[PDB]
Each structure stands twice: as structure tokens, then as C-alpha cells.
Write an enzyme that holds these catalytic residues in place. Structure first.
Site, PDB file in Angstrom:
ATOM      1  N   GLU A   1     -24.593   1.135  -4.446  1.00  0.00           N
ATOM      2  CA  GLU A   1     -23.373   1.924  -4.578  1.00  0.00           C
ATOM      3  C   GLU A   1     -23.690   3.392  -4.847  1.00  0.00           C
ATOM      4  O   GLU A   1     -22.921   4.275  -4.452  1.00  0.00           O
ATOM      5  CB  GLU A   1     -22.511   1.303  -5.685  1.00  0.00           C
ATOM      6  CG  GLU A   1     -21.085   1.822  -5.861  1.00  0.00           C
ATOM      7  CD  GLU A   1     -21.004   3.070  -6.717  1.00  0.00           C
ATOM      8  OE1 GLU A   1     -21.880   3.240  -7.596  1.00  0.00           O
ATOM      9  OE2 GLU A   1     -20.071   3.873  -6.529  1.00  0.00           O
ATOM     10  N   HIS A   2     -24.809   3.664  -5.515  1.00  0.00           N
ATOM     11  CA  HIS A   2     -25.261   5.048  -5.651  1.00  0.00           C
ATOM     12  C   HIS A   2     -25.838   5.583  -4.344  1.00  0.00           C
ATOM     13  O   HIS A   2     -25.600   6.742  -3.986  1.00  0.00           O
ATOM     14  CB  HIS A   2     -26.293   5.156  -6.766  1.00  0.00           C
ATOM     15  CG  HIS A   2     -25.692   5.052  -8.126  1.00  0.00           C
ATOM     16  ND1 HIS A   2     -25.028   3.924  -8.553  1.00  0.00           N
ATOM     17  CD2 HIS A   2     -25.633   5.936  -9.150  1.00  0.00           C
ATOM     18  CE1 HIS A   2     -24.586   4.119  -9.782  1.00  0.00           C
ATOM     19  NE2 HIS A   2     -24.948   5.328 -10.167  1.00  0.00           N
TER      20      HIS A   2
ATOM     21  N   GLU B   1     -28.108   7.712 -17.151  1.00  0.00           N
ATOM     22  CA  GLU B   1     -26.739   7.518 -17.549  1.00  0.00           C
ATOM     23  C   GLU B   1     -26.714   6.306 -18.448  1.00  0.00           C
ATOM     24  O   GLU B   1     -26.044   6.303 -19.466  1.00  0.00           O
ATOM     25  CB  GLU B   1     -25.819   7.334 -16.344  1.00  0.00           C
ATOM     26  CG  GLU B   1     -25.973   6.018 -15.609  1.00  0.00           C
ATOM     27  CD  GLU B   1     -25.066   5.924 -14.400  1.00  0.00           C
ATOM     28  OE1 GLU B   1     -24.229   6.829 -14.213  1.00  0.00           O
ATOM     29  OE2 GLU B   1     -25.190   4.946 -13.637  1.00  0.00           O
TER      30      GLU B   1
END
Lengths: 38, 51, 414, 98, 34, 21, 399
Positions: free
Chosen positions: G52-53, G129
Site C-alpha cells: 500500500e505504500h 512511523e
């Protein structure tokens, strides 16, 4: 569980009723055992 | 609206009215002017403001 | 069914659209933002915004709260520096009593002193929750340093004014700014007729033009807040166009040329000009906030404290390039497409559509079809964009900074 | 009926100890609520009145006659407020039954 | 609304009384009563 | 963060029908 | 309500293209995929997140920033998200741009390019993150309410995965997840707003026609005690019926009845399982009182509902779960899930019928079925010493 173990109220009833009979039953069996021993 | 772009919730505030959390968001015994400040504190003497 | 915008004689601008929607929405828009206070009644609009569920002449607080929650409807208050909007929404079969509740709240409050004394702690809690993020504090600081009197007033109540706002100040603010000539009642999913009947049983009694506000005056300056955050936030703005000019359209095209938010998750001339020199994480965008007498346009940067300087400089330099005519027509066309797509997606939702109609009503008394706008945005042309830029690059700036500001530059260095 | 009232008034005696009718209302939940809402002045005044009464009772003594309350002067400071507390209280109750 | 509330407990209440009553007769060892 | 280590296995304790249990 | 029915035409590969035309001029064209952390096998626990990144960093056709640039130029907003069961890539854009809103989406699902160079950076992004994802206490609480409730199953593991896997991931692994869980019969092309269904079906035939063709709840408790935090977050849940179970609706009404601090309520549904419960944040000293309060309420519904309150609940549900003109994005999202979970788009009239058939008796019956005498999963984080242990919450689950 679905009759005597679902809600506290049901649980209470079985306790009262069962205890009612267990008393006599216990004594009755004890009679045999006691007489058996003696 | 059009002007909001990505700064809308910053130029606007919306109370919920009817429909991270706040992080838990003293009193001391209590003119002249213009003498530059020089704060002083001491081991025995209470600290003071020399405004 | 195009909005049947109609202006009742008093001044109320009634507008409606029978979208035959299952869930309707009825809002009422007043020109009673925080810009209409002065130094004696600061924070009164914040308590007025939070006082929407108080006892009214016609329904108590208990009756209002339990009656809105009984049908599952929603009552909300949104406030800018110019405008307040009280919005109710619910099933079509309950919007009669929803209009009863909303129009009672707008027209006939009581403002009992024990209720506002209970509400001041909620005022403090709401201010803390709002200032939990750095953008809100830096925009409030930017407005406070940018303007002198009117638009410098904060959206949230100051710390000293909590415990000092009285019932008489709320009553004076309502009696001086909640008049019929400053109000528009906008309804999506309702018949126009009913809006009018509720507009005579209510919204017609308070009919003055109210108390006129002062003209906002620019001051310039810079306010800095050293608070030891991990990221430095900095907004540098200047005076720009107001609501009702084509230069406002030029400034909107200018922010969509410079960059006005990521279209893609996790990721702009500004962004390119920063990223060609700095490998640190950053977030650079263009800020534009225009009100009916004055506007602010500038740059907004979030960056690591260390690089905070040259990143800001890089962003500033990019705007100077746009002030020198260094732009391409394809970039301006892409900016226009981004701006018009943002407008259409802003009005594609029901509450955004109701807000837009509302704003237009109070602002110009007229409804501008989405189509009309599209051709006006198209009117903005390349030179126009350049022009707005030079306005920013020349006009005295106002700077709000927060974070570890040891390497954050000043305005005379910027 | 005023005669009756005034008479009963003197008979009750709450007047003698410098206390208006309201000063002598038991602090039920509702009364308590209204008391809070009272504007500060009345509240502070109420307090002195009550404190004074207590002191006098301590000595089993009454105020000089002149200082006695007057049937006419007596004002009901809480009445206006109390009604509201009751009204609000009842409203919530009926709504409960809903 | 209260009626509904009452209805819900009426049977359970009887159940509770019955529970105690069963034990009651047993505890009382009353042969006359049950 | 909060995902690196998973619930330690209680299999041994686990009594590998709930109504019955 | 004259609801715009959701016409869904299927494709050969099985993209099950669907659509719900709307007057709105802009539209939201998304691809849903039945692929989440539940389909991962603990050796590729962050493959969906890391893909997804990587999915917006360029495909053969759009090397580098091309993808973001074009989807930026067109003026569209590009978004993606991943849950434990579904993955979504959607674009909000002016309807006329469907032609490119669809071709772009085709690249994102197939022909995607996972530059190893980029792979390296995204790894760092995700990892860093995550190093800070700990700041989202609520997400933490909810990713343990999952770990301790679904111990030993693929539903315990988080969407992001453990830092370990994140560091240890390679193109080929990703390629596998991509080539394994991106099948055409498990894909829905959903469109909402100003779109024509025949044009969207023709575009799906032209592009995207190439796509290749015992979970258990464990009553348990996790307590992360850290007394330096100012506030405590506690989530208590039981086993949700599921996505398809009809009683879900009578449970939503129950949540609408309930609605210390931040006392939210949730009904998270997965394929024949779920978590139904409440999450609340309170100062430590009040955690026990909150818990007591909350347990009493669930119990109230179980034995003492009231038609009036049910109504309050039915109405709030009604104003909710509308997903109609709520906006292209929300609607498309709903369609996206409806085709993945139910296999069809449930119209709002059927939702209204299922809401109006709910009364107080069946609400307390279903609540007694799902809340009464059940073993909950408890997840606490913060100053949680006064949070009661499992016997006390165990006993508060019944009267």
C-alpha cells in the site's frame, strides 16, 4: 447452562430444589452405609 | 469552502453542541516603573523582584 | 430544483431545495462571528457557540436535548471569524420540531446565569482540545499579529476572560448581531414554503440591521512561540483580496499553483523547491483565508527545527519566481482544474452544499450556480495569478512561528 | 385572611429571629438546587441571616422587637427560583415515563 | 415505559419468590406446606 | 511500538461448547 | 426515497464492476480487494501495508512521480487504505475523468512496479512511523483488543505487522502477496456519483480485464501498564456476530442505546466473527466506576429495554447508515465493502425494513445472546492499576 446457568435467577431455583432432595438422599445413603458399617 | 483547501478546520470551529482526549488541561501571597529587572534569591531571605 | 433563493422583506434570505432526500438538512446563517467583538467582550462568540443547548423561551435544555436525540437528529454550530451557522438535520417527518428547536435557539434564548456558569468549564475544555494541535495555535497567532482590531479577535476564548463572561454580554451580542437583515435560512430536502412560515413565526421579530462592525486593519509583525515541539510550524502571510473580487479568484488559482494539499496519500512548486534542497521531512503549502473586507495569503511550513530556516527561504524564493513571471500555462491550467475539482467535491456533499448556499446568501444574497463559478475561475488568467503573487511578495508580512525557533529566521531576514 | 396570616406569622416566630419565610425551608434536594442558583448577594445575605439566627438560639434569645421581620417586608427570594427547580424536575420525570 | 419494565420482572420476580419458596418449604421442613 | 511481540501462548493452560464449559 | 439502485455488472475475470450513478459531478472510482492481514501467514505480516505504500511510487507506465503527477494534474485525490480483511485504492475525481481514473487504477492493481530502491525508503517510512505509531494510544488499545481476543489466529496480527517483518521484506515476497491476493474474482471496481454504468463497464473491459483469475475469539486480557501516561484507554469486547449475520442490525440499535469519558461503542465485523464492545478513556481513579457503569448498561438492555429508547436507537441508526449522497467517497466505499462482504449492495430500503422490524423484545433477546454471561476481551493501556481484573469484569457480565 441454558436452563440453570444462564441467569442468576435460574441458577437459584435449581439450587433450592436440588438441595431439597439431596438432603433426604444423603441421609438415606448414609443409612445404608451406617448400617453397613454396623 | 473553495478557499478552505486543506485549512478549513483551522479557519473554522465547530462545536458539537448536541452530538487524543483532553490531557488534564497557584495562589501566592501578593506603581513605579522602568528600572531594569534584577531578580534575586537567597538561602534565608525570601526571593524578590526588583522591577 | 434550483435553490429558490428568496429574500423576505426584512432581509432574511430564504433558500431551499426539495431534493426529496431521505435525510434533510436545515441551517441558519448569521453574520455574528468573532470579528464583531471588541476588547471588552472577547470570547463571547465562543460561549455563544457552546451555548446552543441552553434553555430557550419555548423549550428547556432537557427538552431540546432529549427531543433532538429522540428522533436521532443532529444539531451543530460552525463558526468562522465572520459567520455563525446553526444546522439541524434529520428525517423529513421530524424536521418540523427540528425547526421549532433550531429557531427557538436562534431567536429566543434565555441565557440563565447558572447555565453559563456551568458552561465556562466546558469552554476551557473545548479550548484545550482545540489547541492540542499546532496548526490551530499558529493560525490564531498569525491572525492576532496580522490584524489590529477586527479579524485579530480569536475564535477561542482567552484565558483571562473565562469566568468573566456574563449573561448580559451574551444578550447584548445576540440583540446586536442576530437581526433579520444578517440572517439566511437555508433548507435542503424541505419545501420553500415551510421555510417561510417558520421565517415569520420566527426570524422576523428581530429585524434591525444590528450593530455594524469595524473595518479590519492590517498591522504586520511576527509572533513567536518557543515551546520545544519536535517540528517548527511557521506561517508567513500578507494582505490579499477580499470576498467579491476577481483578485480573490487569482489568489485561489495561486494557492492551487503553489500547492494546496496532497491529492495522493502520503504526498507543488513549493514542495518541489523545498525537496530539491532538503532531504528532511517537511510539509509546505499555501494558505489563503479571505473575508468580506480583507484577505490573508501566504505560505505555511512544517519542518525540522534545524532546516526550518532555508526551507522557509526556499518556499519564499519559489513565490518570488512566480512574482517574476516564471510560470507555464499548463501549470496554471492544472491549478484551475485542481481548484474547480476541489469546489465541486466541496459542494458534492449535503452539508457542504447547505453551507455553500448559506455563505453565498449572507455574502451576496444570491446563489451562484456551480457552473457559473467554473467559468469565472476560468476567467482568472496567467498574468492575474502573477499579479496576486507580487502582492504577497511586496505587502508587509505577518509571521506566526512556533517550536524550537533557534534557526527560524525573522521577517527582516526573510 | 391577612390578619390570619400576619397572626400566624408572629406565632411561628421565624420573624423574631430575623428570618424570612424562605430562610426556613428544609434543604431538600430541590431546595438545595435553588439555593445554589441564588445570586451571590442573596446567598451571602441568606447566610448571615441564618448564622445570626443560630447565634440567637444559642443564647435562647430573640432579636430586639424592632429588628423583627415584618409580614409585609418579608420577601420570598427563592420562590421564583424554586418553582423552576420543581418545574424542571417534573418535566424530566414525565419524560421518563414516555 | 414503566409498564414494560414491570412486565419484564414480574415473571422473574415470581421465579425468585419461587426459588426461596422451594427452599423455604425445605428449610421449614414443613410437610403441611408442600 | 505495540505489535512486535504477540500474545504469549497459553496453549498449555488453554482447555482446547462454551455453554458446556 | 427513489434510491439510485446500484447496478453491478460482472466481468470475465470477475471484477464484479459496480456503480451507483449520482448527480454529483465528481465521482469516486475505487478498487476493493479481499486481502488483508487475515490472509497473511506471519512470514509476510506487513506485505499489504508495505505494498500500500509502494503502490503510488510508480508503475512501468508511470515511472517515478508520474502516477502522482498525473492523478495530481487531473485534479483528483488519490487515497488508499488497508484493514484486516479489505484493501482499497480509490480516486475522487471529476466524473469526466473516469477514462483516466480507471486506467490509472488499472496500473495500481496490475503492472505495478515495486522499485527496490523505493522499497528501501518505504521500509524506513513504515518503520519510523511505527516507532511513533505508539502515540496513537487508541490504535494500540484496539490492536491488542484484537491480539488478546484472537490469540493464535491470523486475526490477532496487526495490519502494519511487527517491525521485524517490516525490515525483513523483499520484492519477491511482496510480489507474491501481490500475485496471490490480487485475484480478479476477489476484486470489485466500485463507482459512485456522476458515472454511467455502461461506460464504466466498457472501461473495465478495456482496462483491468487482465487481472489473473477457524477464526476464534478467546476470552482473555492484556494489560499494558505504563503509569507515566496521563490518561487510560480501556476496551472491552465480546464476539460480534459477523458481517452477514442478520442480528448485526439489532446489535447496532443496542449500540445506539448506549451511544466516564470518550465512551464510544463499536461493532467491528469480519468474516463470520467480530468484536462488539466499548472503548473509554478515563483518569485512572475512575476506571473501575466507569467499568461498573458500562456493565450495568449492557445489562439494562439485556433485561430492561424500553420501546421509547429502542426508538431513540432506531432513529439514530436511521439517520446513520445512510451512505446516500453522503458523498461519492462514502457511498463508493460502502458499495466497495458491500460487494466484498455481502456479495451485493444492500439498498437503504432493506436497511429501513430491517430497522423497523426491530422491537424491544428481540433486542433484549439478541443482547442476552451476545452480552449476557459472556467472557470478554479486555485491553488496557496507561495508569490501569484500578482497572479491575478478570473475575470482577467476569462477574459484572451478569446480574
Amino acid at each position: 447452562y441454558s436452563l440453570l446457568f444462564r441467569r442468576t435467577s435460574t441458577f437459584a431455583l435449581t439450587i433450592a430444589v436440588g438441595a431439597l432432595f439431596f438432603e433426604r438422599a444423603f441421609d438415606q445413603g448414609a443409612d445404608a452405609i451406617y448400617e453397613h458399617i454396623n | 469552502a473553495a478557499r478552505s483547501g486543506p485549512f478549513a478546520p483551522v479557519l473554522s470551529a465547530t462545536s458539537r453542541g448536541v452530538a487524543g482526549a483532553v490531557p488534564a488541561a497557584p495562589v501566592l501571597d501578593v506603581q513605579a516603573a522602568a528600572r531594569p529587572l534584577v531578580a534575586t534569591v537567597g538561602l534565608n531571605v525570601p526571593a524578590s523582584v526588583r522591577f | 430544483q434550483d435553490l429558490e433563493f428568496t429574500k423576505l422583506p426584512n432581509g432574511l434570505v430564504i433558500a431551499s431545495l426539495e431534493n426529496y432526500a431521505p435525510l434533510s438538512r436545515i441551517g441558519l446563517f448569521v453574520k455574528a462571528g468573532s470579528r464583531y467583538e471588541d476588547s471588552n467582550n472577547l470570547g463571547t462568540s465562543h460561549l455563544l457557540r457552546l451555548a446552543s443547548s441552553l434553555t430557550t423561551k419555548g423549550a428547556s435544555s432537557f427538552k431540546i436535548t432529549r427531543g433532538i436525540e429522540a428522533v436521532g437528529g443532529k444539531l451543530s454550530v460552525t463558526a468562522t471569524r465572520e459567520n455563525m451557522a446553526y444546522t439541524v438535520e434529520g428525517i423529513r417527518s421530524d424536521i418540523e420540531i427540528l425547526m421549532e428547536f433550531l429557531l427557538n435557539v436562534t431567536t429566543a434564548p434565555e441565557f440563565r446565569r447558572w447555565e453559563v456558569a456551568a458552561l465556562r468549564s466546558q469552554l476551557k475544555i473545548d479550548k484545550a482540545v482545540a489547541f492540542q494541535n499546532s496548526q490551530t495555535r499558529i493560525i490564531e497567532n498569525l491572525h492576532d499579529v496580522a490584524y489590529k482590531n477586527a479579524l485579530a479577535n480569536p475564535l477561542y476564548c482567552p484565558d483571562y476572560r473565562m469566568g468573566k463572561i456574563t449573561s448580559e454580554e451574551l444578550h447584548y451580542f445576540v440583540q446586536n448581531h442576530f437581526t433579520s437583515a444578517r440572517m439566511a435560512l437555508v433548507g435542503l430536502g424541505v419545501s420553500h414554503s415551510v421555510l417561510k412560515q417558520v421565517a415569520e413565526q420566527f426570524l422576523n421579530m428581530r429585524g434591525g440591521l444590528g450593530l455594524a462592525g469595524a473595518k479590519a486593519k492590517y498591522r504586520g509583525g511576527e509572533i513567536r512561540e518557543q515551546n520545544g515541539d519536535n517540528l517548527v510550524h511557521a506561517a508567513i502571510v500578507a494582505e490579499s483580496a477580499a470576498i467579491g473580487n476577481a483578485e480573490a479568484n487569482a489568489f485561489s488559482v495561486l494557492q492551487h499553483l503553489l500547492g494546496a494539499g496532497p491529492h495522493i496519500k502520503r504526498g507543488s512548486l513549493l514542495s518541489q523547491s523545498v525537496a530539491k534542497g532538503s532531504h528532511q521531512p517537511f510539509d509546505v503549502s499555501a494558505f489563503n483565508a479571505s473575508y468580506s473586507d480583507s484577505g490573508l495569503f501566504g505560505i505555511y511550513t512544517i519542518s525540522q527545527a534545524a532546516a526550518a530556516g532555508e526551507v522557509i527561504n526556499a518556499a519564499y524564493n519559489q513565490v518570488k519566481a512566480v512574482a517574476q513571471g516564471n510560470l507555464s500555462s499548463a501549470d496554471v491550467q492544472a491549478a484551475k482544474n485542481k481548484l474547480k475539482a476541489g469546489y465541486l467535491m466541496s459542494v458534492e456533499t449535503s452539508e457542504g452544499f447547505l453551507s455553500e448556499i448559506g455563505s453565498q446568501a449572507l455574502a451576496a444574497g444570491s446563489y451562484m450556480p456551480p457552473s457559473t463559478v467554473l467559468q469565472q475561475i476560468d476567467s482568472v488568467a496567467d498574468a492575474d495569478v502573477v499579479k496576486a503573487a507580487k502582492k504577497f511578495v511586496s505587502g508587509k508580512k505577518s509571521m506566526a512561528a512556533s517550536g524550537n525557533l533557534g534557526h527560524t529566521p525573522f521577517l527582516d531576514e526573510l | 385572611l391577612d390578619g390570619f396570616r400576619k397572626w400566624y406569622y408572629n406565632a411561628a416566630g421565624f420573624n423574631k429571629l430575623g428570618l424570612m419565610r424562605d430562610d426556613t425551608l428544609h434543604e431538600t434536594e430541590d431546595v438545595k438546587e435553588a439555593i445554589r442558583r441564588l445570586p451571590e448577594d442573596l446567598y451571602n445575605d441568606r447566610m448571615f441571616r441564618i448564622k445570626r439566627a443560630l447565634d440567637l438560639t444559642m443564647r435562647h434569645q430573640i432579636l430586639p422587637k424592632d429588628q423583627w421581620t415584618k409580614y409585609e417586608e418579608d420577601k420570598f427570594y427563592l420562590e421564583p427560583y424554586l418553582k423552576e427547580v420543581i418545574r424542571e424536575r417534573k418535566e424530566r420525570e414525565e419524560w421518563a415515563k414516555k | 415505559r414503566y409498564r414494560e419494565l414491570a412486565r419484564n420482572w414480574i415473571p422473574t420476580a415470581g421465579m425468585w419468590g419461587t426459588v426461596g419458596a422451594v427452599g423455604l418449604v425445605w428449610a421449614t421442613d414443613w410437610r403441611l406446606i408442600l | 511500538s505495540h505489535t512486535d511481540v504477540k500474545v504469549p501462548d497459553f496453549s498449555d493452560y488453554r482447555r482446547a461448547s462454551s455453554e458446556a464449559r | 426515497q427513489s434510491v439510485p439502485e446500484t447496478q453491478v455488472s460482472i466481468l470475465d475475470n470477475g471484477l464484479r464492476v459496480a456503480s451507483e450513478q449520482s448527480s454529483h459531478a465528481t465521482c469516486t472510482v475505487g478498487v476493493w480487494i479481499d486481502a488483508g492481514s487475515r490472509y497473511e501467514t506471519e512470514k509476510n505480516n506487513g506485505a499489504g501495508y508495505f505494498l500500500e505504500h509502494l503502490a503510488f511510487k510508480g508503475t512501468k507506465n508511470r515511472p517515478g512521480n508520474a502516477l502522482e503527477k498525473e492523478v495530481e494534474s487531473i485534479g483528483a485525490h488519490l487515497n488508499a487504505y488497508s484493514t484486516r480483511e479489505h484493501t482499497a485504492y480509490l480516486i475522487k475525481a471529476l466524473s469526466k475523468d473516469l477514462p483516466k481514473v480507471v486506467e490509472l487504477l488499472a496500473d495500481i492493481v496490475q503492472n505495478s512496479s515495486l522499485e527496490d530502491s523505493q522499497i528501501e525508503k518505504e521500509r524506513d517510512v513504515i518503520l519510523r512511523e511505527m516507532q511513533e505509531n505508539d502515540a496513537s494510544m487508541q490504535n494500540v488499545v484496539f490492536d491488542y483488543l484484537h491480539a488478546t481476543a484472537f490469540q493464535g489466529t491470523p486475526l490477532a496480527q496487526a495490519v502494519e505487522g511487527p517491525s521485524e517483518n517490516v525490515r525483513r521484506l523483499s520484492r519477491t515476497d511482496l510480489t507474491d502477496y501481490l500475485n496471490r491476493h490480487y485475484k480478479a474474482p476477489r476484486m470489485v471496481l466500485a463507482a459512485a456519483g456522476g458515472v454511467e454504468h455502461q461506460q464504466l463497464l466498457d472501461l473495465a473491459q478495456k482496462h483491468l480485464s487482465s487481472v489473473s483469475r477457524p477464526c476464534r475469539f478467546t476470552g482473555s486480557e492484556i494489560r499494558h501498564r505504563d503509569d507515566a501516561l496521563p490518561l487510560a484507554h480501556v476496551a472491552i469486547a465480546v464476539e460480534g456476530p459477523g458481517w452477514a449475520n442478520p442480528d448485526n442490525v439489532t446489535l447496532q440499535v443496542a449500540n445506539a442505546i448506549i451511544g466516564c469519558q470518550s465512551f464510544q461503542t463499536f461493532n467491528i465485523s469480519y468474516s463470520d466473527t467480530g468484536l462488539l464492545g466499548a472503548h473509554f478513556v478515563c483518569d485512572a481513579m475512575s476506571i473501575d466506576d466507569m467499568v461498573f457503569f458500562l456493565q450495568g448498561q449492557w445489562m439494562r438492555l439485556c433485561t430492561s429495554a424500553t420501546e421509547s429508547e429502542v426508538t431513540r436507537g432506531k432513529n439514530i441508526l436511521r439517520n446513520a447508515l445512510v451512505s446516500h449522497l453522503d458523498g461519492t467517497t462514502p457511498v463508493c466505499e460502502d458499495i466497495g465493502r458491500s460487494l466484498l462482504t455481502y456479495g451485493r449492495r444492500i439498498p437503504l430500503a432493506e436497511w429501513e425494513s430491517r430497522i423497523q422490524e426491530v422491537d424491544a423484545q428481540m433486542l433484549r433477546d439478541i443482547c442476552s445472546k451476545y452480552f449476557y454471561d459472556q467472557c470478554p476481551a479486555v485491553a488496557g493501556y496507561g495508569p490501569i492499576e484500578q482497572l479491575p481484573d478478570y473475575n470482577r469484569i467476569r462477574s459484572g457480565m451478569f446480574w
